[PDB]
Design a protein around this ligand. Structure first.
Ligand SMILES: Nc1ncnc2c1ncn2[C@@H]1O[C@H](COP(=O)(O)OP(=O)(O)OP(=O)(O)O)[C@@H](O)[C@H]1O
Ligand SMILES: [K+]
Ligand SMILES: [Mg+2]
Ligand SMILES: [Zn+2]
Lengths: 204, 461, 176, 283, 195, 196
């Protein structure tokens, strides 16, 4: 079991990773549930305290900071879900059992509702009035996919060796580098995405 | 040594002013105003800054006092300090930007101006602030900042000789420094200037006329010569009303009396102003202004608002004030593929009874138009309205001088007393009013000028 | 990320204050904040320090590295070197701004400190500009930026990354 | 401002030099000559003036004023400095705040003018303070012009027990003095100038009643009363109760809305009537 | 050919700040009518190609099919961009829209907005034990627990706590907790005073 | 919270829902017709074989096939050797706004037609971007509270996006340093709706 301070540390780490990643990252139900529970317990405890105290104000300020971080993180995830909904749903549909999910159940319900609402609107406003063979729009092709070739700044948390930098399509130009702990690099996201997933690097 | 120490101390103080000056408060925030401006301008490739005298006085009153009393030396020290600070703000620099550039320091103040008439001898070599109107501008010419000289006989060279700013020359060495032994002596005046070794800046000369309201009763307006250089060059054009900060100075020509100088009076000298800063008076758009203009254009009654703003002192004339608004804005000039042009300017004639504010309307439009010229038909001629051919005093050749409709190009020309104009003079305006050009074929000059102006005329029946 | 969020991150750094009130140990989710006793120093996060100062409850103490001699040595070293040198704090600019804006009465020689921090910031920004120009001009695929702080990266990161994305797409046009 | 403008627009020096007169300008020139200050320097903005003249300015001004019959040129006050630039005397801040609050720019309401004035007192809104300084300069010039118009035309007429001056709608700047606070301050400055510039000894020991138009729709006039102007005045005012007693005895339509009882709103037609009662009440 | 759909696209492109113009009903109907005309001509051409074995008509059929696809693409892009602007409305103003903004939207767009609003409310309710977390608040990092607010317009009663309310009238000032004033500040009803 | 669909013109295919891509593909492109085209003569009744026409890029992309059955495509003059040589001399002085607002996006999509000059078009587009980067970066990050009309006059649509990003970064830091980044303000849309 994590200490509460470590829990807030992981919350901030996920916040920044989601803020800079070009795609929807992996869901973290434990972090969200634990943080919400911590906020609820702190609110209850403060309800037992007197209003005039300095301690109550300090506790409230800390809770405000935690709440802001959680809200911003969830907003970022929701924006990504709305931007790429067909592809998010497709990835979730065909996921292997062992592999971790990128959607919480509630996010999944939200995404399904978003897709159905948008499709029904498009059908009812224009597509039903088009010629019979033009009535189907494949939303999978109409909505752009995440661009995984984006450049990101990262800080190394755990040393990594033999990372393959590919400057272009030509193989002969590709070379290899080392990532040392504490070092900071600017590199394409596609090369280092598994390291973001495992926690070896932090996106800044 | 002692003079060097004093100069170094003053330069250090100027440098500290540039490094440390700040604007703001502890409630809001703070900005290192001049250091930041220097850093941004240098990155943009614009090697100049403008310094407020009040800020310098706030940092160090003695520095401002020295700059006012002895502008030349202390301005040079301030420019050196500016160059030093520009290196520190931008010091690691990208390839092809190794060489540090000189910085021109402009001067600006909030003090009340003084008139041309008030410029007296006791103010010579001082910093002065003068309002006026630009009446003439010269061509852009090259002025040496650094020269290298070479000996005719021995090819001995002296390099990187600094030049004085302004309208001041240089006296070459009389004798060469080569060894007397072995070689036949070098001739007197052995040194010549090496063309390709010279570093030059752009320079300009201007005539500044006194403000019309400042002229004493019954006197012709006076003017003064202005010397501009570097980024001050080509900023103003004839017709601009300006306030200039500068050094009241004297032309330093050769000491010798070459061509047997024979002046009508002895010990007389020619004065001029060495310009250190220019401020154009209303009589680029900031983003705040642009947003405000977009707000005005979107008002549902903008047409009514503009009409109400035209000559608000006149009691009625709502339809004539609406038509003048259209003339001020104008139409769209077009060029068709075949090369034929369609004009976008609007011409308006007021023909009517006496004492109906026709002249007052013309006077307002002169002030309101971005470019506006007021003339009288009685006091005009065909050459005066379009353009004239005359002899150049210096060259002994024919030149061209533009008239009212060349000075009003891109704006409005208000012709009062249009009925009093002679028929031969009126007829000279037909081409300019429609084709918007002036064709000249006289005295060996065959050229065409632009006259894209709107005519606003008034006359009696 | 915007600058307010980098400042939010910077506000989690620990500073020392002397309170004028008494309070028992506080068990914050982030971590315990020791007992507060009038006249004695205690370590708290920067956000709480600023809040207590604004409410007239504490006096702030400058960090150890906020010393004119040390800062002058650091500025000289930064100017001498070619890469980025290690900074006294990962949020030196934000800490300087907050502390000097809110507690200059508590920090002697605040003007000199501000000027030295400004000098360091200018030098490092110029080094970052050189790095970006070299990245684009030489057509690199990767770069190392050690000892660079979050605020420095955030000042021009979006522009550089967008330019690099466009340049990569232009470099990979011909691949079918 | 410039030293010349400050001398011309300060009620103290402006009243003692009688600058509304033709000989007052000559007296001011004599004062400046006694100082040894070049005219072009005193007409320049104080900040831009040469520093050598500023070294002993307060002492020399005090000495010259003493020679010219002004013994109270110097006052104990306070100043505040911050930054490199910002320096203010207390009275400057007072004047700027007053001008922001009593601004004649009617695009903004009076609750809107109150908000501007309150904001200006915070160092974050420094631009508002400078704007208020400019407005204060304009208001001071207007005050001096109105005082000159009143004194030159003999508009301050002595009834038995008090002096009476009435502003008319033909007056140019009347709009700037319709608000009660501006009218009160103007009346005090006018009384000081009048007491300095009058010959009759009796009229120097009288209080003042001043009226100015308020609303041309309802025909209402603002009436203010101030006590006699003396160097040791207790600053005590009896006009509120006198006004209430005159209105009751005469049955005029008066409104007490100002927090000061010496400022009233009166129906213009009743005015004449009102005044007679007041006279009979105070004589 | 596809110039009407190009007008549809240009209208939106000319307003890159996200404002919602009035729904272009006539333009949409024009595009649909053109699509029907193209489809009928193509159908006649296809029938003739089958009947008489004329190969020369195939390029014309391809040309018309491409034109139809272009019209469809422009229509769908226009509608989707409008949906994006409407979605932004929810996060910028709130759950209840001003009537001025409601006027520009089509009825089907209002139905879409209502459905999206319901889905967002459900998700926000599902996060926590009770009432969940309303992630439409806390849009900026917090600094102080309390703030000073000035009323920019008359608004009437405003509930601080269930027990107590305060009357919002123009140019009054209140010292209040930030989390109760954030929404009204974002809507332009209150102004945040810094001193 | 409003983010339009982004351009995909520099990639292998453009984005279906991108307004910029639709406007870009509206632009014309010279073609030569390789087959008689009946019943469309009214719009250019048959169009004879070998005729020369200007078609929108979307229409040319639809009819084009690698074996050149219906039409063959010719490059616009802007992408031919004559102008490529001008670009190499100094890419900073060419006005890419007048020479096609979507200069890079249009040139990128021309590579779909398998011209013999594909390698030269590709290399030119890259060098032009590299040769113009420093000026774009400097002007965007150092023009503060000034008129930028002359700084973006010659930039194309893709470059104007970068310039806006650079200005945003400069403005955000200036606001933070001046203490304006902490005030809670009315939303951007509310400001543009209720005060514009
Ligand atoms: N409608 C008006 N409103 C205000 N002032 C007016 C009006 N008409 C005339 N005036 C004033 O009366 C005088 C008219 O002189 P002005 O030179 O403007 O007349 P004019 O119509 O041009 O006459 P003229 O044909 O004799 O030259 C000016 O003082 C002008 O200000
Ligand atoms: K001669
Ligand atoms: Mg006339
Ligand atoms: Zn020699």
């Amino acid at each position: 079991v994590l200490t509460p301070a470590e829990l807030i540390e992981r919350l901030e780490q996920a916040w920044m990773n989601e803020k800079f990643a070009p795609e929807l990252l992996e869901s973290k139900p434990e972090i969200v549930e634990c943080v919400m529970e911590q906020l609820e317990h702190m609110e209850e405890n403060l309800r037992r305290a007197k209003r005039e105290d300095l301690k109550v104000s300090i506790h409230q300020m800390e809770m405000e900071r935690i709440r802001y971080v959680l809200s911003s993180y969830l907003r970022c995830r929701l924006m990504k879900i709305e931007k790429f909904f067909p592809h998010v749903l497709e990835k979730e549909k065909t996921r292997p059992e062992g592999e971790p999910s990128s959607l919480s159940p509630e996010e999944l319900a939200f995404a399904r509702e978003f897709m159905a609402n948008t499709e029904s609107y498009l059908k009812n406003v224009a597509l039903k009035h088009m010629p019979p063979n033009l009535q189907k729009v494949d939303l999978f092709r109409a909505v752009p996919k995440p661009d995984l070739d984006s450049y990101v700044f990262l800080r190394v948390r755990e040393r990594q060796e033999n990372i393959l930098v590919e400057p272009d399509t030509d193989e002969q130009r590709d070379y290899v580098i080392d990532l040392e702990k504490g070092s900071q690099h600017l590199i394409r996201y596609k090369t280092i995405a598994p390291l973001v997933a495992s926690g070896a690097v932090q996106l800044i | 040594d002692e003079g060097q120490a004093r100069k170094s101390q003053l330069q250090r103080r100027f440098k500290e002013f540039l490094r440390q000056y700040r604007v703001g408060t502890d409630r809001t925030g703070f900005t290192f105003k001049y250091r930041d401006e220097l850093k941004r301008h240098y990155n943009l490739g614009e090697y100049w800054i403008e310094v407020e005298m009040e800020d310098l006085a706030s940092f160090d009153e003695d520095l401002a006092d020295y700059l006012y009393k002895q502008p030349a030396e202390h301005l040079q020290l301030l420019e050196e300090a500016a160059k030093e600070v520009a290196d520190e703000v931008t010091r690691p620099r990208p390839s092809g930007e190794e060489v540090l550039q000189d910085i021109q320091v402009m001067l600006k103040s909030d003090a009340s101006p003084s008139s041309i008439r008030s410029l007296k001898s006791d103010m010579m070599s001082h910093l002065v602030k003068i309002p006026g109107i630009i009446i003439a501008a010269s061509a852009v010419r090259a002025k040496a900042t650094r020269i290298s000289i070479q000996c005719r006989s021995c090819r001995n060279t002296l390099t990187n000789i600094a030049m004085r700013p302004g309208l001041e020359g240089y006296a070459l060495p009389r004798k060469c420094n080569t060894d007397q032994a072995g070689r036949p002596k070098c001739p007197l005046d052995p040194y010549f200037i090496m063309p390709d070794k010279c570093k030059c800046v752009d320079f300009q000369t201007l005539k500044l006329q006194e403000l019309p309201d400042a002229v004493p009763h019954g006197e012709m307006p006076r003017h003064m010569q202005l010397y501009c250089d570097r980024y001050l060059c080509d900023k103003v054009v004839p017709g601009n009303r300006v306030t200039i900060m500068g050094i009241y100075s004297i032309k330093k020509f050769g000491l010798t009396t070459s061509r047997g100088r024979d002046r009508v009076g002895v010990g007389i000298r020619s004065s001029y102003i060495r310009v250190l800063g220019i401020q154009v008076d209303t009589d680029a758009v900031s983003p705040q202004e642009e947003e405000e203009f977009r707000r005005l254009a979107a008002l549902p009654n903008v047409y009514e608002v503009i009409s109400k703003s035209i000559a608000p002192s006149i009691f009625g004339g709502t339809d004539m004030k609406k038509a003048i608004a259209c003339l001020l804005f104008g139409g769209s000039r077009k060029r068709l593929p075949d090369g034929l042009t369609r004009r976008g300017d609007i011409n308006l004639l007021m023909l009517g009874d006496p004492g109906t504010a026709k002249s007052q309307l013309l006077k307002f439009v002169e002030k309101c138009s971005p470019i506006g010229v007021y003339t009288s038909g009685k006091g005009s001629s065909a050459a005066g309205l379009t353009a004239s051919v005359m002899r150049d005093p210096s060259s002994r050749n024919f030149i061209m001088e533009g008239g009212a409709m060349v000075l009003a190009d891109g704006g409005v020309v208000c012709i009062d007393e249009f009925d009093k104009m002679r028929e031969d003079d009126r007829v000279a305006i037909h081409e300019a009013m429609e084709q918007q050009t002036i064709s000249i074929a006289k005295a060996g000059i065959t050229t065409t000028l632009n006259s894209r102006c709107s005519v606003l005329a008034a006359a009696n029946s | 990320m915007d600058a307010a969020e980098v400042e939010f991150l910077a506000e989690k750094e620990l500073v020392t204050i002397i309170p004028n009130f008494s309070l028992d140990k506080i068990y914050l989710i982030g971590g315990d904040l020791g007992p507060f006793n009038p006249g004695l120093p205690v370590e708290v996060p920067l956000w709480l320090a600023i809040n207590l100062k604004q409410r007239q409850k504490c006096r702030l103490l400058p960090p150890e590295w906020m010393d004119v001699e040390k800062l002058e040595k650091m500025r000289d070293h930064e100017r001498k070197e070619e890469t980025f040198t290690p900074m006294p704090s990962p949020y030196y600019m934000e800490l300087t701004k907050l502390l000097l804006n809110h507690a200059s009465d508590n920090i002697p020689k605040a003007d000199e400190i501000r000027t030295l921090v400004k000098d360091m910031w200018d030098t490092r920004i110029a080094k970052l500009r050189v790095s970006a120009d070299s990245f684009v001009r030489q057509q690199e695929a990767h770069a190392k930026l050690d000892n660079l702080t979050l605020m420095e990266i955030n000042t021009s990161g979006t522009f550089l990354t967008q330019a690099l994305n466009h340049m990569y797409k232009l470099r990979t046009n011909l691949q079918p | 401002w410039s030293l010349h403008d400050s001398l011309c627009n300060t009620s103290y020096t402006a009243a003692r030099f009688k600058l509304w007169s033709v000989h007052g300008q000559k007296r001011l020139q004599e004062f400046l000559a006694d100082m040894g200050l070049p005219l072009k320097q005193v007409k320049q903005k104080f900040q831009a003036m040469d520093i050598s003249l500023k070294e002993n300015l307060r002492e020399m001004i005090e000495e010259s004023a003493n020679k010219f019959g002004m013994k109270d040129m110097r006052v104990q006050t306070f100043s505040i400095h911050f930054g490199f630039k910002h320096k203010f005397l207390a009275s400057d801040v007072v004047f700027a705040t007053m001008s922001l609050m009593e601004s004649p720019e009617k695009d903004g309401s009076g609750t809107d003018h109150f908000i501007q004035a309150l904001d200006s007192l915070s160092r974050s809104n420094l631009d508002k303070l400078y704007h208020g300084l400019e407005l204060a300069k304009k208001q001071l010039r207007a005050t001096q012009q109105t005082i000159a118009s009143c004194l030159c035309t003999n508009l301050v007429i002595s009834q038995g027990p008090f002096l009476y001056c009435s502003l008319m709608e033909g007056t140019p700047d009347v709009m700037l003095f319709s608000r009660p606070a501006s009218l009160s301050l103007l009346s005090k400055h006018l009384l000081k100038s009048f007491v300095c510039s009058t010959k009759n000894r009796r009229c120097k020991l009288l209080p003042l009643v001043m009226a100015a138009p308020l609303s041309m729709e309802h025909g209402t006039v603002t009436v203010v009363g101030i006590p006699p102007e003396t160097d040791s005045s207790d600053r005590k005012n009896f006009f509120g109760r006198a006004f209430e007693k005159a209105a009751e005895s005469t049955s005029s339509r008066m409104l007490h809305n100002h927090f000061d009882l010496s400022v009233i709103e009166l129906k213009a037609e009743d005015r004449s009537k009102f005044l007679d009662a007041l006279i009979s009440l105070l004589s | 050919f596809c110039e009407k759909a190009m007008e549809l696209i240009r209208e939106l492109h000319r307003a890159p700040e996200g404002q919602l113009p009035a729904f272009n009903e006539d333009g949409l109907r024009q595009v649909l009518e053109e699509m029907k005309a193209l489809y009928e001509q193509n159908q006649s051409d296809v029938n003739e190609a089958k009947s008489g074995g004329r190969s020369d008509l195939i390029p014309t059929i391809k040309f018309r099919h491409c034109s139809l696809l272009r019209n469809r693409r422009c229509t769908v892009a226009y509608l989707y961009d409008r949906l994006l602007r409407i979605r932004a409305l929810r996060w910028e103003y709130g759950s209840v829209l001003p009537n001025a903004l409601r006027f520009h939207m089509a009825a089907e767009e209002m139905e879409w907005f209502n459905n999206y609003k319901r889905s967002l409310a459900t998700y926000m309710r599902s996060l926590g034990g009770d009432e969940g977390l309303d992630i439409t608040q806390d849009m900026k990092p917090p600094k102080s627990l309390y703030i000073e607010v000035r009323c920019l317009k008359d608004y009437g009663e405003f509930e601080v706590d269930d027990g107590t309310s305060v009357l919002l009238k123009k140019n009054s000032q209140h010292f209040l907790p930030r989390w109760k004033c954030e929404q009204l500040i974002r809507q332009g009803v209150l102004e945040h005073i810094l001193s | 919270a409003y983010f339009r669909v982004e351009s995909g013109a520099l990639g292998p295919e453009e984005n279906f829902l991108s307004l910029d891509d639709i406007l870009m593909s509206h632009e014309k492109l010279p073609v030569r017709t390789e087959t008689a085209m009946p019943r469309l003569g009214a719009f250019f009744n048959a169009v004879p074989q070998g005729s020369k026409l200007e078609l929108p890029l979307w229409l040319a992309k639809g009819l084009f096939d690698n074996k050149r059955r219906i039409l063959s495509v010719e490059l616009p003059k802007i992408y031919q050797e004559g102008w490529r040589t001008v670009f190499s001399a100094d890419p900073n002085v060419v006005d890419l706004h007048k020479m096609g607002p979507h200069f890079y996006g249009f040139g990128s999509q021309l590579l779909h037609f398998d011209s013999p000059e594909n390698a030269d078009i590709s290399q030119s587009l890259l060098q032009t971007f590299i040769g113009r980067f420093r000026r774009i970066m400097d002007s965007s990050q150092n023009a503060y509270n000034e008129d930028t009309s002359a700084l973006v006059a010659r930039l194309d649509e893709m470059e104007r996006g970068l310039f806006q990003t650079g200005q945003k970064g400069l403005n955000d830091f200036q606001c933070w340093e001046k203490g304006q980044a902490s005030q809670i303000t009315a939303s951007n849309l509310v400001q543009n709706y209720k005060k514009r």
